């Protein structure tokens, strides 16, 4: 009795005042959640939720019990008490409770069902009977429990559970249906695939139940069902195979019914779209999918400016998206997503069938839709469309002058989108059509929105246009954009500025002659609307970099004085930082005196802490609404992380990094500070990988700055050690790669013997944990379903090992022995194989490997003739390196294989020109090691593999060997080719050979060579 009113007072104190409520909070956490009181507390809260006549106490207790029962956890609760808790929870559930309390009871009950927990067959019985209750809330609540605890589905007899769900799908109550569908999908969510076939057979009942929602006009409930179905498509797309046409046709039917509210229609579209992302082969094998998908997104794209045919409201607004045009926005993203998954082969035809027709409609909305659809699809359909580019402009460009301004904006949109998506080929070949088209829209004759969008599209075009292509168009581009600069509308001016900036960036030195007109107009705008000023300083400094320092000097001082005023006076802050940074690229070392102005603010931003809020289950989701926040669950609990702030930290770190890169020795004074207060702490930012990576790349660059100008040695020890330590903790494979790369770059900077023996040992463990977890993730990649990330990581591990070998000067062989099992497993899935071979090549570089000759040559010799070029490459290099560093413990292999090599050689094609060049070098190595001991055809074979133009270290050997007939023209050319291709003293050898021939015989060899390479030849000989 006592315990009860203590606890009762506490929980009642929760609703309320700080004092009474804080006393209760402490009491709960410090006194009641302890080994000694936990079961009393859980017992209490279960009893309150079950029996309390007060709504709020009941609700709260149910929630608290749920939370605390995890943490306990339920497993360490005494059997007698579990049972009592179970029985009261259950009695409460079966009693008369408000809906939301039964929900919370259900959630509490779920915490009491567990693999290790004793069977609770009274629950099973309660659920079965509740499912048949005439009270919807009982039925709904039971499916909810089967959602939280899908294992219970396995526990019921299969012939009971099946009709339970079938009744569920078909229930009179919407709520019950939604919960049945939720429970049904939850099963697949939670259980192994080997359990899936047991409920999979229910899919047709579910699909067949769906037309009922449209009959009754229950579209909100439809949307929820569509959301469950979307999750099921991501889990088991192939389950939908047999009834694919029916679900396609159904989503079609919903979307077209445009008396329905948006949610049913947007979720139906999503359902359709998501098949392309999870079962592409399925979509592609069915012409109906593509046709339906195109047709419905085209319908939805026309849903703009409704009830406003003149677009007055659109004409009058800024250049942002109208948040009321939801289905339009959805349609665009969907077409884009499917095009990107399926390609043009499959969608262009159906797409264009419709566009040809919509371009000609008298309804403007359809002519617009056409342009926006093309815009959405062009990237994904590039494989086909990139070739039919005159045809596309023939459709679009006529519309640039449509009576309706929104159709015009639409056409500008396409010219913009494709300038990006088909770049750089479109800039080269359609400039003569695209630029005049966009330039004509800049005139003040057109509407603000159109002038702006045409100027936006000129950013897309410019980004990939060489200065020479833009040159004849600059005066025209510029005179027009100046007028836009004089607009009354802020967004027109802001666009004008950005377009000029980016045109100047592309124009480079060709912009020098426009600088005197622009620069004063820009200075005037600044001396006077935050974004205007920012875009204005951005325009100024991009012009500055375009024209170079000398020209920039006519206004740099004044510009700098304005920036100072601006900086010390929120989107502006970021334009300011970029501008200062760009001035540092212009001014070079002359920036040094400005570091004390510019660096302090960067230090503040780059010192941002991992802004975490240890957060509550409910209190998430709505925290998630904000683009600037995310929530995850890491080790059970919920964490709110301020994402934007951490993006900004990265951006600042990238600027510090770029100052350090440009200023070299002159940045040294900041190295210790940035290293200890920014780079290093950033590795411990487990919630944001950008930070971790940005911290990593900063390290070698900081070291290199201090080098150029004891401390250095300390910092490197600290930095390398945290890098190394990151290898055994870092969860994200892409980051792990950055660390290895970062070590490589560190080692390269620091030089000889930069690592200590313990570090070398700690590295090895990290290398092993990395290899182990890569193996484990990869041995995971079906009945129900249709990774360079991994390849890239292994690529870099190769580099770090190599780098470590080199700094240790061999000594790392010792440590390298511990991961030989690991290496060996890899050697005998192509990516792991390539890796292994690459490692072995490095090993030999430092005849102490005999211990393993027998363990690998069997696989290497196999690999030589592999269908895979990357394997042959790595293999041959190994055999060649054998004859170089281990001449004698390897002969029985090298000379036999030698015929294999003459065959692998025979190939000379971009994709494998690299592999055959290694083999070529590999045979020249064998010919060297065992020079007059060979059974000589060989050398004349080898020669016919010249020239070597791609692999540099290979080329380096071959021409060294060449430097030790009427082959004379092929001798020379073999060299000119290597030089000219910049792949590789053999010159000295050659001049002597040309000595052995007349005036006229000598000259004639170069007779084939064009002017430009004869310039080089003169400067080589």
């Amino acid at each position: 009795e006592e315990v009860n009113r203590t606890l009762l007072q506490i929980v009642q104190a929760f609703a309320s005042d700080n004092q009474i409520r804080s006393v209760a909070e402490k009491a709960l956490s410090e006194e009641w959640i302890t080994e000694n009181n936990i079961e009393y507390l859980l017992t209490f809260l279960a009893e309150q939720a079950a029996f309390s006549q007060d709504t709020t106490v009941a609700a709260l207790s149910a929630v608290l019990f749920r939370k605390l029962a995890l943490k306990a956890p339920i497993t360490h609760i005494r059997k007698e008490v579990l049972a009592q808790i179970r029985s009261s929870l259950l009695k409460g559930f079966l009693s008369e409770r408000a809906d939301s309390i039964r929900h919370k009871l259900s959630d509490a009950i779920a915490e009491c069902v567990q693999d290790d927990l004793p069977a609770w067959p009274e629950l099973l019985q309660a659920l079965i009977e509740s499912l048949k209750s005439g009270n919807p809330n009982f039925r709904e609540s039971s499916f909810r429990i089967l959602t939280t605890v899908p294992y219970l589905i396995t526990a019921v007899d299969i012939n009971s559970i099946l009709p339970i769900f079938q009744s569920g799908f078909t229930d009179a109550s919407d709520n019950v249906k939604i919960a049945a569908v939720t429970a049904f999908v939850g099963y697949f969510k939670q259980l192994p695939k080997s359990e899936w076939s047991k409920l999979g057979i229910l899919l047709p009942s579910l699909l067949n139940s769906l037309p009922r929602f449209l009959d009754d006009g229950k579209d909100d409930a439809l949307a929820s069902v569509f959301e469950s179905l979307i999750e099921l498509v991501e889990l088991a797309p192939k389950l939908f195979k047999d009834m694919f046409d029916q679900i396609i046709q159904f989503t079609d039917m919903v979307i077209k019914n445009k008396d329905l509210e948006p949610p049913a229609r947007t979720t139906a579209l999503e359902l359709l779209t998501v098949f392309s992302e999870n079962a592409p082969q399925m979509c592609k094998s069915n012409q109906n999918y593509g046709q339906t998908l195109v047709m419905v997104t085209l319908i939805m794209m026309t849903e703009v400016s409704i009830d406003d045919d003149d677009a007055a409201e659109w004409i009058e607004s800024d250049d942002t998206d109208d948040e009321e045009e939801v289905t339009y926005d959805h349609a665009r993203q969907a077409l884009d997503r499917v095009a990107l998954k399926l390609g043009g082969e499959y969608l262009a035809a159906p797409l264009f069938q419709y566009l040809q027709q919509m371009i000609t409609s008298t309804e403007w909305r359809e002519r617009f839709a056409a342009m926006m659809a093309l815009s959405s699809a062009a990237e994904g359909c590039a494989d086909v469309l990139i070739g039919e580019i005159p045809k596309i402009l023939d459709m679009v460009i006529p519309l640039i002058n449509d009576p309706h301004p929104r159709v015009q904006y639409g056409c500008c949109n396409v010219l913009g989108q494709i300038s990006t998506d088909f770049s750089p080929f479109i800039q080269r070949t359609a400039h003569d059509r695209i630029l005049p088209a966009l330039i004509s829209k800049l005139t003040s004759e057109c509407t603000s929105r159109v002038q702006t969008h045409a100027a936006a599209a000129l950013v897309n075009f410019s980004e990939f246009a060489s200065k020479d292509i833009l040159e004849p168009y600059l005066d025209s581009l510029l005179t027009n954009l100046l007028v836009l600069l004089q607009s009354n509308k802020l967004y027109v001016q802001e666009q004008a500025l950005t377009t000029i900036a980016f045109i100047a960036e592309a124009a480079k030195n060709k912009f020098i002659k426009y600088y005197d007109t622009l620069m004063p107009l820009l200075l005037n705008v600044l001396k006077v609307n935050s974004v205007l000023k920012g875009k204005c300083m951005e325009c100024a400094t991009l012009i500055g970099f375009a024209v170079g320092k000398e020209k920039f000097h006519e206004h740099s001082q004044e510009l700098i004085s304005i920036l100072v005023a601006l900086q010390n006076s929120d989107a502006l802050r970021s334009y300011l930082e970029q501008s200062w940074s760009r001035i540092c690229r212009i001014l070079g070392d002359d920036f040094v005196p400005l570091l004390p102005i510019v660096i302090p603010p960067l230090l503040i931003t780059a010192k941002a802490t991992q802004d975490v809020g240890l957060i509550e289950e409910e209190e998430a989701a709505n925290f998630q609404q904000y683009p600037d926040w995310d929530v995850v669950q890491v080790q059970g609990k919920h964490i709110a992380i301020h994402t934007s702030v951490l993006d900004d930290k990265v951006s600042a770190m990238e600027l510090l990094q770029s100052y350090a890169t440009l200023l070299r020795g002159q940045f040294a004074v900041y190295v210790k500070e940035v290293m200890e207060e920014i780079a290093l702490p950033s590795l411990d930012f487990y919630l944001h990988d950008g930070v971790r990576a940005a911290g990593a790349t900063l390290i070698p660059i900081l070291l290199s700055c201090l080098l150029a100008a004891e401390e250095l040695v300390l910092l490197w020890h600290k930095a390398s050690s945290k890098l190394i330590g990151g290898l055994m903790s870092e969860p994200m494979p892409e980051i792990t790669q950055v660390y290895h790369n970062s070590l490589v770059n560190g080692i390269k900077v620091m030089g000889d013997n930069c690592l200590s023996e313990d570090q070398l040992a700690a590295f090895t463990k990290g290398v092993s944990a990395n290899l182990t977890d890569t193996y484990e993730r990869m041995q995971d990649r079906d009945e129900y379903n249709e990774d360079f990330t991994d390849e890239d990581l292994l690529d870099e591990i190769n580099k770090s090992i190599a780098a470590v070998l080199k700094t240790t000067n061999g000594h790392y062989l010792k440590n390298l022995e511990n991961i030989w099992p690991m290496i060996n497993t890899f050697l005998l899935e192509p990516i792991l194989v390539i890796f292994a071979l690459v490692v072995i090549g490095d090993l030999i570089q430092y005849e102490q490997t005999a211990s393993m000759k027998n363990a690998f040559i069997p696989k290497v010799t196999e690999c030589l003739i592999s269908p895979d070029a990357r394997i042959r490459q790595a293999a041959s290099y190994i055999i060649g390196v054998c004859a170089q560093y281990a001449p004698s413990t390897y002969a029985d292999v090298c000379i036999p294989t030698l015929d294999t090599l003459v065959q692998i050689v025979d190939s000379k094609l971009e994709e494998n020109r690299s592999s055959t060049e290694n083999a070529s070098a590999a045979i020249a190595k064998i010919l060297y090691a065992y020079n007059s001991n060979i059974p000589d055809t060989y050398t004349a074979n080898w020669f016919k593999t010249l020239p070597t133009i791609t692999d540099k270290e290979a080329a380096s050997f071959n021409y060294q060997f060449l430097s030790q007939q009427s082959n004379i023209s092929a001798v020379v050319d073999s060299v000119i080719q290597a030089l000219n291709e910049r792949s590789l003293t053999v010159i000295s050898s050659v001049k002597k050979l040309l000595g052995f021939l007349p005036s006229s015989d000598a000259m004639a060899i170069f007779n084939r060579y064009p002017a430009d390479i004869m310039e080089k030849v003169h400067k080589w000989f």
């Binding site: 998206d321 665009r332 993203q333 815009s375 959405s376 913009g416 936006a456």
Partner: peptide, 10 residues
């Protein structure tokens, strides 16, 4: 803001 692009809520 301030090129021609397509947005993304996937």
């Amino acid at each position: 803001a301030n090129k021609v692009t397509k947005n993304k809520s996937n």
